[PDB]
Amino acid sequence: WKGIAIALLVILVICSLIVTSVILLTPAEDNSLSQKKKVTVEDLFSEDFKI
Amino acid sequence: RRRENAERLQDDADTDTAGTMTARQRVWRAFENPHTSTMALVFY
């Protein structure tokens, strides 16, 4: 009565691996912070922007 | 006393539950009781 439980364990772990795969697959997130300071008032008169 | 002894007699007719062999309803009853077949228990 234990081997049937082993088959149940293997089918449930197959299902769980499917769940983990879809968890890593469907939400293909990407933050891409690109944290650079916004242009301030003095920037137009900063020497860097002095064309 | 008689209703007591009829109470212990009504369930004495539990014989229809005896020997996926008859129809779709057969496998239905098979997984209704999760000890008849290996599929029933694993599903349960």
Q: Which residue, B12, B31, B32, is CA-closest to B40?
A: B31
Note the resolution in Å, 1 decimal: 4.2
Query: Do B43 and B31 contact (CB within 8 A), yes or no?
Result: yes
Please indicate whether, in this complex, the C-beta atoms of B41 and A4 are within 8 angstroms of each other: yes
Q: Is A11 on the interface with B (CB under 8 A)?
A: yes
Instruction: Give dist(CA B28, CA B33) in Å, integer.
Output: 9
User: Cα dihedral angle (B8, B30, B43, A8), rounded to 10 degrees?
Assistant: 100
How many Cα neighbours within 13 Å face the side chain of B13? 4
- Give A20→chain B minimum CA distance, Å: 21
Rounded to 5°, angle at Cα B14 from B8 and B15: 140
Experimental method: cryo-EM
Q: What is the DSSP letter of A51?
A: -
CB B24 within 8 A of CB B12: no
d(CA B38, CA B34): 8
How far off is chain A from B38, nearest CA to CA, in Å? 7
Answer for the pair A1, B38: CB distance below 8 angstroms, yes or no: no
Tell me the C-alpha distance between B19 and B30, whole Å: 11
Residue B38 contacts A, CB cutoff 8 Å: yes
d(CA A7, CA A47): 72
Q: Does B39 touch chain A (CB under 8 A)?
A: no
